[PDB]
Design a protein around this ligand. Structure first.
Ligand SMILES: Nc1ncnc2c1ncn2[C@@H]1O[C@H](COP(=O)(O)OP(=O)(O)NP(=O)(O)O)[C@@H](O)[C@H]1O
Lengths: 47, 295
């Protein structure tokens, strides 16, 4: 068995980024954690 | 550095009969894009009578080519084929393949739970389509999930091949102002390079495997800031091979990005992530898709 993967659901015709500012979206993976805004060339921090 | 703009005015297979509005019958609206509605049409005249096509209506469309018909050369197993192009009353009409499989994101959402190997198949077919346009000097530029469709057999089909389009007045927006898949150089307006497509490729790979976008902001302004300056923590449910590809793809300097080296696309094909893909069999459509649409 591979590493447990998250349940993935999308909203097709994705809603525009500008609108829906405070509307909560259903429960899933929140997103990548922003470690800092250092602007490094390598976007992902090394493990 | 030479860039050439080819205006899309008319198109038909060489030696075939050019089409006009009278030869099509409208059936329904397939979907809504940035440039307008996409229609389903039935050919009522000619050798392809009774065949169904997808139709886009635009003010004009041009293809930017850097460095045989270009509309014929762009033909690829995983790219929509343009069958007719004609102009009437100051409007451009594009007659395309009717993609009956739907979009990939809806199919993935229908499954909810899937493997990395499942997403791998679609990324690999997407990679071949992008390189084919790159081989002819074309940039996809604005790659987004709306452009990623499936055919009846379940194979990837891009809805466009790098066309620069302008919508009709009815569809015209007041403010021209999608940044989520844009590369840092694009945000900086440094120019759109072929390495920018592989950045968009990486964001799609991230979104398909995680279900979330790597850079999330409240508005266009914030997300652009995140693309330029954000440092992210690798999701730990991703496989080591997937993390490696994302790290090589997510480099803010275009030259450091995978696929921008001398070998080009074979850098990505040879990556540990795509090890289980037989690329020649994939191109021959001899590898079954993970999910069939008809279900
Ligand atoms: N050939 C096709 N066959 C079937 N459906 C299609 C086809 N082309 C487009 N669609 C549908 O129409 C939607 C919009 O197509 P798309 O190519 O994204 O439009 P667009 O005018 O290029 N705007 P955009 O993609 O946002 O730049 C797609 O997501 C599909 O649902």
């Amino acid at each position: 068995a591979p590493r447990r993967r998250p349940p993935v659901k999308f909203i097709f015709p994705p809603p525009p980024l500008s609108s829906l500012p405070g509307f909560g979206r259903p429960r899933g993976y929140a997103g990548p954690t922003v470690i800092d805004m250092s602007a490094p060339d390598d976007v992902f921090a090394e493990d | 550095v030479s860039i050439k703009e080819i205006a899309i005015t008319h198109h038909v297979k060489e030696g075939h009969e050019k089409a006009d509005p009278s030869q099509f019958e409208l059936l329904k609206v397939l979907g809504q894009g940035s440039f307008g509605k996409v229609f389903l049409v039935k050919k009522i005249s000619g050798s392809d009578a009774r065949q169904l096509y997808a139709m886009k209506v635009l003010k004009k469309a041009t293809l930017k080519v850097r460095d045989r018909d270009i509309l014929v050369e762009v033909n690829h197993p995983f790219i929509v084929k343009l069958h007719y192009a004609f102009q009437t009353e100051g409007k451009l009409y594009l007659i395309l393949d009717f993609l009956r499989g739907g979009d990939l994101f809806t199919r993935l959402s229908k499954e909810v739970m899937f493997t990395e190997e499942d997403v791998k198949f679609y990324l690999a077919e997407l990679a071949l389509a992008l390189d084919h346009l790159h081989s002819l000097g074309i940039i996809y530029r604005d790659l987004k999930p709306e452009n990623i469709l499936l055919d009846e057999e379940g194979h990837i089909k891009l809805t466009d091949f790098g066309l620069s389009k302008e919508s009709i007045d009815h569809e015209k927006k007041a403010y021209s102002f999608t940044v989520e898949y844009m590369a840092p150089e694009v945000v900086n307006r440094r120019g759109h390079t072929q390495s920018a497509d592989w950045w968009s490729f990486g964001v799609l790979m991230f979104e398909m495997l995680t279900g979330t976008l790597p850079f999330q902001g409240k508005d266009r302004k914030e997300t652009m800031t995140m693309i330029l300056k954000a440092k992210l923590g690798m999701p730990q449910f991703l496989s080591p091979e997937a993390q490696s590809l994302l790290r090589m793809l997510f480099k803010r300097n275009p030259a450091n990005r995978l696929g921008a080296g001398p070998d080009g696309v074979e850098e990505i094909k040879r990556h540990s992530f795509f090890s289980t893909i037989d690329w020649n069999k994939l191109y021959r459509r001899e590898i079954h898709p993970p999910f069939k649409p008809a279900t």
